[PDB]
Design an enzyme around this catalytic site. Sequence first.
Site, PDB file in Angstrom:
ATOM      1  N   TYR A 106       8.021   4.840   0.871  1.00 38.25           N
ATOM      2  CA  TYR A 106       7.317   4.347  -0.294  1.00 38.25           C
ATOM      3  C   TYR A 106       6.957   2.904  -0.123  1.00 38.25           C
ATOM      4  O   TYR A 106       7.802   2.020  -0.194  1.00 38.25           O
ATOM      5  CB  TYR A 106       8.171   4.595  -1.525  1.00 38.25           C
ATOM      6  CG  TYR A 106       7.638   4.110  -2.843  1.00 38.25           C
ATOM      7  CD1 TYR A 106       6.301   3.775  -3.017  1.00 38.25           C
ATOM      8  CD2 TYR A 106       8.502   3.945  -3.923  1.00 38.25           C
ATOM      9  CE1 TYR A 106       5.844   3.284  -4.226  1.00 38.25           C
ATOM     10  CE2 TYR A 106       8.055   3.449  -5.133  1.00 38.25           C
ATOM     11  CZ  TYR A 106       6.730   3.122  -5.277  1.00 38.25           C
ATOM     12  OH  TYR A 106       6.300   2.642  -6.485  1.00 38.25           O
ATOM     13  N   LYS A 128       3.813   7.247   1.044  1.00 38.89           N
ATOM     14  CA  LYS A 128       3.251   7.030  -0.284  1.00 38.89           C
ATOM     15  C   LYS A 128       2.633   5.633  -0.201  1.00 38.89           C
ATOM     16  O   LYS A 128       3.334   4.631  -0.225  1.00 38.89           O
ATOM     17  CB  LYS A 128       4.316   7.074  -1.375  1.00 38.89           C
ATOM     18  CG  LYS A 128       3.740   6.673  -2.692  1.00 38.89           C
ATOM     19  CD  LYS A 128       4.763   6.691  -3.782  1.00 38.89           C
ATOM     20  CE  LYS A 128       4.099   6.174  -5.071  1.00 38.89           C
ATOM     21  NZ  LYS A 128       5.116   5.892  -6.099  1.00 38.89           N
TER      22      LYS A 128
END
Lengths: 291, 291, 292, 291
Positions: free
Chosen positions: A134, A162
């Site tokens: 992330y 992500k």
Amino acid sequence: NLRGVMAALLTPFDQQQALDKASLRRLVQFNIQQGIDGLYVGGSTGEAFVQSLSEREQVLEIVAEEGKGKIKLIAHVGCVTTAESQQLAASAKRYGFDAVSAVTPFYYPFSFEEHCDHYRAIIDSADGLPMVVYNIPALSGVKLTLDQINTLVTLPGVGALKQTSGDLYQMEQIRREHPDLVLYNGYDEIFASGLLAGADGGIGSTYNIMGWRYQGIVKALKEGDIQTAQKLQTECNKVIDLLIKTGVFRGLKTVLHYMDVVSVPLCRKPFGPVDEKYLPELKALAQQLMQ
Amino acid sequence: NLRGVMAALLTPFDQQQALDKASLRRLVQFNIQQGIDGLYVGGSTGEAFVQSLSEREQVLEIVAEEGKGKIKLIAHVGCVTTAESQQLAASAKRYGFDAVSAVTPFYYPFSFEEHCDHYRAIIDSADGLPMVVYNIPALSGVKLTLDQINTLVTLPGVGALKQTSGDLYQMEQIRREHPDLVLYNGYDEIFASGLLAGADGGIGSTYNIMGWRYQGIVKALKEGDIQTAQKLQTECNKVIDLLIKTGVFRGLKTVLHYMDVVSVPLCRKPFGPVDEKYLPELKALAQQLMQ
Amino acid sequence: NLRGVMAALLTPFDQQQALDKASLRRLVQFNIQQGIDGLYVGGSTGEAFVQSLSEREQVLEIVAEEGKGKIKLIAHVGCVTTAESQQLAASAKRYGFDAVSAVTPFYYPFSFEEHCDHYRAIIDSADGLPMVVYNIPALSGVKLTLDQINTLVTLPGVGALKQTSGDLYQMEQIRREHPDLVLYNGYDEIFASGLLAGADGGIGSTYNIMGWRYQGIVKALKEGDIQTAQKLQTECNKVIDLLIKTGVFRGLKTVLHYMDVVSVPLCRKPFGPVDEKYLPELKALAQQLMQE
Amino acid sequence: NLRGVMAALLTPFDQQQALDKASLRRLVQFNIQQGIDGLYVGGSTGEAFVQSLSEREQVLEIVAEEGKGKIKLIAHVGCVTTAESQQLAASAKRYGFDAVSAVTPFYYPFSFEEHCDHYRAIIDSADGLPMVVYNIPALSGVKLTLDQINTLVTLPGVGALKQTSGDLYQMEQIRREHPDLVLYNGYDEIFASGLLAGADGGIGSTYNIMGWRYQGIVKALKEGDIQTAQKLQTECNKVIDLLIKTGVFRGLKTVLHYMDVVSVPLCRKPFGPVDEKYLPELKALAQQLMQ
């Protein structure tokens, strides 16, 4: 297989600012109902960084009871602490989440080597559930290079990235370098542009109230229809404009309250409530989206 | 009628670091034959900031002689000084350029009104020529807000915006606010995505050597063939990855050189020459681009 | 009564990453014997953001026991969450600390009002203990303005400002605006210049191993001996240079471990261990500081 | 021997915004009488970047003429172009300035090697004049690393460094590395603190209206009277507070105008005028200063 349009689930709190389990369940179901591909739980949007590990696990367990088997569930497990992240990684596994994810640890500056070992330790604890790196430079303050990103993304155990970054040059270099990588577009505002650049799906907070639009943009782009793709995007963008004025988490919760999904549209302190002056636009928005 | 794909023209120099007028003319023609829509002359790509007004006025005159009437001509007249810019603006008019342009004045910090008054003056001296506000925050150090961008963009006499920002949420915001505005995508690396965001053309330094691909990307998006649009962008990006390695201006000039357009692929010092190791790939690209 | 040179206390952990209470107590006493004015516990240096509330409560409680009004005690109680900060603020009062402190909440961007309300609620839960507003832009990523700082610093309950910023123009202006404000300089590397600019003391991580040099710079300036003021600061900087190479917290714990104060020179992951290559310099540093 | 408090020269313009020679000379002498150790002419404070080579040279000669021999003279010869800089370096030699000076070439991003060679070339043209490296990241957009500043400062020909950075840890690090280096503190708001950190002098704009205070602080610090040293710095900051509020260059010229030094307190466009609401404040300032 983890590809798609996943919503970054919000966490409903009550007047006492405790978790609102009933609204949580309403929210999970409401997202399922709107045809979302999965849920990214306990992320920034879920106000993870303002709740405890137990509060965090409690949410994972409940959404797993509600959604397990019906859609993909990615548990955001990251904390600044690797040990805290590992504990969460194990619970997600225990609850039956499909994958685990973690923000690049923040506040304290860690080497890139320390970042890799963090992911390695968490992945270990995931015990099989794939890891979604992330990346949100804007909040983490962690500015990784493409090379560092290529390293992380190739770490055995990692199944996705992500990308919460508006650098669409990088978005495509990542795609050019990892043709098979599950790439999630992190900024809703540039979703259509992100997919065209290389993202193959997305995770975001606004998906909670208008997820169908993102699915729409996805089909249109597939069906070579840039007209509806662009149209859908500007409609998401007008909403994002307002939410940015009101406060995205709180504004999304407020709209959700208007759709009867959430009981108390409050966020935890230091967040304050929405400005009363913004209520007519949010109410109106809730109404139109309800149709 | 200023909409299109405009090459940000390079200015060839000789071994003495003096305009190679013969190659300038050769570059002007080259671009025309590759089906470009017009030329943005005297910009950042043209090394205008390492030039004298007279040097810039000379480049302006030779290209106008070379292409006035054949394609659209936009003259970058910007200088940190309003008066120097007005001078350059006045020659552009006198030489027959279709529009005029100017970077937000840099180095010294200026208030917004100062920025607006700056454009007003230049717009005045341009004597009727539509002005193209030039926004490149990474090189200008000027971080304008959207509201400011709207204000500038709406200033009387202004006819377009050159957006050299990879912020595609702001690209669409601008477009949503100004459906008639001529919006040029300034970052070649994100052309396809920039257009999808709301841009209706682009001005880029890499157009000089493969402008056809950008026009192709335009055709594809126009024809709903996002599949070949993406492909075109990645091909353009592989080039960009290389040029960023070798150094962009000099890399392009070397390619053009292997293409028999520029005699001496030099840039004016402080710029140094390309590293020899890069020569084989640039040579290879040149031959390859001859597609 | 909060003005002074105070060490940003480190939290010793064992080989398994658990708190090493005996080394905590051992480190508290070492700082005391080192003639420091007080301790700042549970802050960035104390690896608070890598602990849990109850973990931070335990540390506060153990040092309050050790520092029984023997020195000034400031409890960094800040968290992103106002409610978690309030709980810690209430424990700090309960343990008998002298002041309460908190960083500007991070990660999620907050408004200035959200920040002011945050400090008030905490000030509210401290129940009488003054609040040392904590400013560290480099880490929090929160960019307060002089006027925003002024508001905060005038806020009822607020009694000090921990300036962890290199901007000495702003340091000058804050002092100008607040002639009696306990202004602590946060970057040890510029301690002498922050003081000359208006800081009336300091809070730092390196005070753990050479708090006397910092006390010395203070005297040096008090007596206009800017000549030794400079020598002390460069001696401090030669040290900080090495600590930055190795990693400050771990480097410090390493020196302190070689001084038999800290049993395990570890920081909780994701901080990794100190590179073997630096051990020769850290052993020598520990030697000479002791020699002194 | 270039050590000392050097005033950063303002270039007075006329109503037509043309070099006001009458006032230049008047200012050169005003600075001299202030007991300033020398003048840094043609720098940022001298609106150099809004002037032309020819104009810059003109100002160079007039000042050599006015204070050559009387005080130390460092001529800021820097531009983005190495060639332009060289030309001005060559002229400084001719006019007989004591030192040469150049900001790291801005706008276009240059490699550290490019930066180094540029200073080399200009050093080559200063024909014996020691070079003063001008570090001002804020405006230049160049953030050299210490090792990089170390390289620059040790270049054959480099005799000093104008550190315009408020990083006073780096200040002491530079003094530690180079104990015999001429280090000028660039930010006047931290003069006292910069000197305590290692600077053996300073080049500032505000020196033009109160150069005595900076010389004052120097003595006090040298005497061990930090108390008055401080009392002095606070006075300069009360001033600096205002100038920033009014615009520094324009505010200074106004104060000097009220001090019958500069006829027209105008900066060149894009800069604008001092708002009227400040004239009384600036008026009051010039009076107090003259007594």
